[PDB]
């Protein structure tokens, strides 16, 4: 089965998906994030950040506090399972992580940790 997904975040604070499925036979999974908007990183930056559903609020809250130079993530935040870098208009970033980090049946959320974005830019990730 395929083990990648392409995702976009725009100037309207939208991701173009709110549900990601990772096939259970994948050993790695790749997220290709792009920003088709016109606004720069420092006002409309987007990352793709993955945690358990329960950890999302904490990661987002400490993330906002950490500032732009830390990609809006608290340093050494063990709650973050995987994440792209933060990007603005016309940029793209890819990450590849181990599916060994994703247990069957557990509930995961992906979201942007740029200030104010997460309520609008979030979705589920599940293994199937």
Confirm or reject binding of residue 74 to Cu ion (CB under 5 A): no
- Cα separation, 108 vs 98, in Å, equals 14
Cβ closest to Cu ion, residue 14 vs residue 127: 14
Q: Per the annotation, does 64 bind a ligand?
A: no
CB-CB contact of 73 with 113 (8 Å) = yes
> Any known ligand binding at 112?
yes
Task: Give the number of C-alpha atoms closer than 13 A to the C-alpha of residue 72, restricted to the C-beta side.
Answer: 25
Instruction: Give me the sheet containing 108-111, strands edge to edge.
Output: 19-22, 122-127, 108-111, 49-52, 82-83
Residues 34, 92 contacting (CB under 8 angstroms): yes
Asked if residue 35 binds Cu ion (CB under 5 A), the reply is: no
Residue 13 labeled ligand binder:
no
Q: How far is the CB of 116 from Cu ion (least distance, A)?
A: 8
Closest contact distance (angstroms) between CB of 17 and Cu ion is: 14
Q: At closest approach, how far in Å is the CB of 117 from Cu ion?
A: 4
Name the segment binding Cu ion (CB under 5 A); options: 18-26, 58-66, 101-109, 115-123.
115-123
Q: Which is nearer to Cu ion, 22 or 63 (CB)?
A: 63
């Amino acid at each position: 089965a395929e083990c990648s997904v392409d995702i976009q975040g725009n100037d309207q604070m939208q991701f173009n998906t709110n549900a990601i499925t990772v096939d259970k036979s994948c050993k790695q999974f790749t997220i290709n994030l792009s920003h088709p908007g016109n606004l720069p990183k420092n006002v409309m930056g987007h990352n793709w950040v993955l945690s358990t559903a329960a950890d999302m609020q904490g990661v987002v809250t400490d993330g906002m506090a950490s500032g732009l130079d830390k990609d809006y993530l608290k340093p050494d935040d063990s709650r973050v399972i995987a994440h792209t870098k933060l990007i603005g208009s016309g940029e793209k970033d890819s990450i590849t992580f181990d599916v060994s980090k994703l247990k069957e049946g557990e509930q995961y959320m992906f979201f942007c940790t740029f200030p104010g974005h997460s309520a609008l830019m979030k979705g589920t990730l599940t293994l199937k």
